[PDB]
Design an enzyme around this catalytic site. Structure first.
Site, PDB file in Angstrom:
ATOM      1  N   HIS A 135     -18.313  -8.741  -9.947  1.00 16.80           N
ATOM      2  CA  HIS A 135     -17.879  -7.749 -10.926  1.00 16.80           C
ATOM      3  C   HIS A 135     -18.937  -7.515 -11.997  1.00 16.80           C
ATOM      4  O   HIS A 135     -19.187  -6.370 -12.388  1.00 16.80           O
ATOM      5  CB  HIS A 135     -16.568  -8.194 -11.559  1.00 16.80           C
ATOM      6  N   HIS A 172       1.789   1.998  -3.390  1.00 21.29           N
ATOM      7  CA  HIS A 172       0.860   2.891  -4.073  1.00 21.29           C
ATOM      8  C   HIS A 172       1.121   4.343  -3.698  1.00 21.29           C
ATOM      9  O   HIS A 172       0.930   5.238  -4.528  1.00 21.29           O
ATOM     10  CB  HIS A 172      -0.583   2.515  -3.749  1.00 21.29           C
ATOM     11  N   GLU A 178      -2.121  -1.182  -9.340  1.00 17.99           N
ATOM     12  CA  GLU A 178      -1.920  -2.418  -8.586  1.00 17.99           C
ATOM     13  C   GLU A 178      -0.618  -3.115  -8.970  1.00 17.99           C
ATOM     14  O   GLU A 178      -0.040  -3.843  -8.154  1.00 17.99           O
ATOM     15  CB  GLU A 178      -3.131  -3.335  -8.803  1.00 17.99           C
ATOM     16  N   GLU A 229       0.821  -1.204   0.000  1.00 18.95           N
ATOM     17  CA  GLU A 229       0.000   0.000   0.000  1.00 18.95           C
ATOM     18  C   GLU A 229       0.858   1.258   0.000  1.00 18.95           C
ATOM     19  O   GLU A 229       0.492   2.261  -0.623  1.00 18.95           O
ATOM     20  CB  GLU A 229      -0.953  -0.013   1.191  1.00 18.95           C
ATOM     21  N   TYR A 281      -7.454  -6.947 -14.257  1.00 25.25           N
ATOM     22  CA  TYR A 281      -6.691  -7.944 -13.510  1.00 25.25           C
ATOM     23  C   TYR A 281      -5.780  -8.744 -14.426  1.00 25.25           C
ATOM     24  O   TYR A 281      -4.723  -9.217 -13.993  1.00 25.25           O
ATOM     25  CB  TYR A 281      -7.632  -8.882 -12.760  1.00 25.25           C
TER      26      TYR A 281
END
EC number: 3.4.17.23
Lengths: 544, 142
Positions: A487, A360, A384, A357, A497
């Protein structure tokens, strides 16, 4: 003046007020998710709607400014993302009824429960309870009916809502001059006027299908190998050349095969690389781990953490009545303030998610030179992948030797290295045909190439060929089992993804080319490589 | 001020500690953003020196500043301080503009909230939670 400077002056007031009002909303988003209170959820939706209404004003005021008028590459892409009509291009009540469907689909998919056939007092939601069965249970027929249950109780209730949903979104997408709502998804990655890295909407279909043929051999290696291990755990339940039963795939829908490690481990007596026994040895805290992450960032040439990070973040759970959601998320609020909500415990996985994280937050520091609308990722798949560079590189045991958790004289044989990397191959290689099938089904349904009485037939037949999964219970068209997945039912594009998993290992080997690691690629660490810092930082200060 | 571990800038444009026997001295006191500090210098073709305060390029005294987030930033919000970011013509040195004129870049009259009508003064928006280069620095320009 020229319209270029009028487009700049439009963004000049925007990039300082939308900087303000996003940071108004994201503060209110932070302080509710860290202090759960009815007043904080009141002001979060107060500031979140005033942000969206201010976004509603400045999008429509940018609709007065045509994108085929300005040759400046920056404010072209800025006004292009501004004046997208989106849901404004349908009628006034048709898109509102369409969003009423999204209101009712997301309600009873989060509320929808399954109830046991002998004890209807014991009812289970998607998490926990039912996914506990679909990831940990050992019975064939209990997992078989519970798999059928999540596809029956909420799949049937999603189906007529999904009928009306896909039509009005396609009428929304064709009114914005597209092919379908699959093509409105494909309009995300398209760029015009940038030589070399242009991308058509037909490019996305053909590029995904091309390099998936590179994925398919190693997946069929994994396909044939886990069939032999599951035959040894399920005797005469799984066909030796037939595909995998969908209720035995370790998760709810078939995306991750990671939970099969209890049943597909080759050598279950070899140890697992775990260093949390040494974290408490030296009495470490979350202040050690995020500082060790920060030291691991500055060891490669990256800058340290901000003062405003240590002031404003929250890396422990706040105990009593101040309630905080404990999902580790990086929170970019604005005005240079970066923070993370994470209930960090003394854990090897919280050690790796700390690097994730804050990885990010690394990318948040580097688009900060750009203006507010270029303060984003370029496409949806670059965030990601950046966060998972530090997850993979700092999980290698050579980093665990240097930190002092794992002993520097500890051996790492390939019998324990393949078993851990096959466990990771159940995750990474398991989700690439599932994602590939997922959008390709969604492509043809929104295009209209699959009839409504063949939606569920083509859905499960594509799992037979692409994913290599035969359904154990046949599904007619009363089901909406793609919408059973979270989704599809609630307006997500799932192709990110795939591309992230592609790009993160395109980046890792390019980082390992920059790190000059001598051994295998899965043992590659980027520690103390200043070229690995420059190469990573460089392609991180561009943004959108 | 010379023997002070309290000011952050100290940019004189050491010997001036005793060189001062000059005539009158002007003191310019104001509050900037912590990342705007670069544009408080001679030249500096950017928003602060173009539109808020232009500085001379040949003779100049000193520039000093220091962190005042605890004073001049409010946790619920300091929206009081503004700064010019739109003006027809850059400032000269010693020039001071208080005109809150609705900006139209085409030289045409401007009545907001119509097309290409903006206000020339963005609020600072300084909280106690913002980044470093995003706080309020009391700048003393000599």
């Amino acid at each position: 003046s020229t319209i270029e400077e009028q487009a700049k002056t439009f963004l000049d007031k925007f990039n300082h007020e939308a900087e303000d009002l996003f940071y108004q909303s994201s503060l209110a988003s932070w302080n509710y998710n860290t202090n759960i209170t009815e007043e904080n959820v009141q002001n979060m939706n107060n500031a979140g709607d005033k942000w969206s209404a201010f976004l509603k004003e400045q999008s429509t005021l940018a609709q007065m400014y045509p994108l085929q008028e300005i040759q400046n590459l920056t404010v072209k892409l800025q006004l292009q993302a501004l004046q997208q009509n989106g849901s404004s291009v349908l009628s006034e009540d048709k898109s509102k009824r369409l969003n009423t469907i999204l209101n009712t689909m997301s309600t009873i998919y989060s509320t929808g429960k399954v109830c046991n056939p002998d004890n209807p007092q014991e009812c289970l939601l998607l998490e926990p309870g039912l996914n506990e069965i679909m990831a940990n249970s050992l019975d064939y027929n209990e997992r078989l009916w519970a798999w059928e249950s999540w596809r029956s109780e909420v799949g049937k209730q999603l189906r007529p809502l999904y009928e009306e949903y896909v039509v009005l979104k396609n009428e929304m997408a064709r009114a914005n001059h597209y092919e379908d709502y699959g093509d409105y998804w494909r309009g995300d990655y398209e760029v015009n006027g940038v030589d070399g890295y242009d991308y058509s909407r037909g490019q996305l279909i053909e590029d995904v299908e091309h390099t998936f043929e590179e994925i398919k051999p190693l997946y069929e290696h994994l396909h044939a190998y886990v069939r032999a291990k599951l035959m040894n755990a399920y005797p005469s339940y799984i066909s030796p050349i037939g595909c995998l039963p969908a209720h035995l795939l370790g998760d709810m829908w078939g995306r991750f095969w990671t939970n099969l490690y209890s049943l597909t481990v080759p050598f279950g007596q070899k140890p697992n690389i775990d260093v949390t026994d040494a974290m408490v040895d030296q009495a470490w805290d979350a202040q050690r781990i995020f500082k060790e992450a920060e030291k691991f960032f500055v060891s490669v040439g990256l800058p340290n953490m901000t003062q405003g990070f240590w002031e404003n973040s929250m890396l422990t759970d706040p105990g009593n009545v101040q309630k905080a959601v404990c999902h580790p998320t990086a929170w970019d609020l604005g005005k240079g303030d970066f923070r993370i909500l994470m209930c960090t415990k003394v854990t090897m996985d919280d050690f790796l998610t700390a690097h994730h994280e804050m990885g990010h937050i690394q990318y948040d520091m580097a688009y900060a030179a750009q203006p507010f609308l270029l303060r984003n990722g370029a496409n949806e798949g670059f965030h990601e992948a950046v966060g998972e560079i530090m997850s993979l590189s700092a999980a290698t045991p050579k980093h665990l030797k240097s930190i002092g958790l794992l002993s520097p004289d500890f051996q790492e044989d390939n019998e324990t290295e393949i078993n851990f990397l096959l466990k990771q191959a159940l995750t990474i290689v398991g989700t690439l045909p599932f994602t590939y099938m997922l959008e390709k089904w969604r492509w043809m349904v929104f295009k209209g190439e699959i009839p409504k009485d063949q939606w569920m037939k083509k859905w499960w037949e594509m799992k037979r060929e692409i994913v290599g999964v035969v359904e154990p219970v046949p599904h007619d068209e009363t089901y909406c089992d793609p919408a059973s997945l979270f989704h599809v039912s609630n307006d997500y594009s799932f192709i990110r993804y795939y591309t992230r998993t592609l790009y993160q290992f395109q980046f890792q080997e390019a980082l390992c080319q920059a790190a000059k690691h001598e051994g295998p690629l899965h043992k590659c660490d980027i520690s103390n490589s200043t070229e690995a810092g420059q190469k990573l930082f460089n392609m991180l200060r561009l943004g959108k | 001020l010379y023997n002070s571990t309290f000011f952050s800038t100290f940019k004189c444009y050491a010997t001036k500690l005793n060189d001062l026997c000059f005539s009158n001295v002007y003191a310019d006191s104001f509050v900037v953003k912590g990342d705007d500090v670069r544009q408080i210098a001679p030249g500096q073709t950017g928003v602060i020196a173009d539109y808020n305060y232009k500085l001379p390029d040949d003779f100049m005294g000193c520039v000093l500043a220091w962190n005042t987030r605890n004073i001049d930033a409010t946790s619920t919000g300091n929206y009081n301080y503004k700064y010019r970011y739109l003006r027809h013509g850059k400032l000269r040195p010693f020039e001071r503009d208080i005109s809150n004129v609705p900006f139209s870049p085409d030289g045409k009259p401007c009545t907001p909230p119509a097309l290409n009508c903006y206000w020339p003064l963005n609020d600072y928006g300084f909280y106690t939670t913002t980044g470093i280069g995003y706080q309020p620095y009391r700048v003393v320009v000599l």
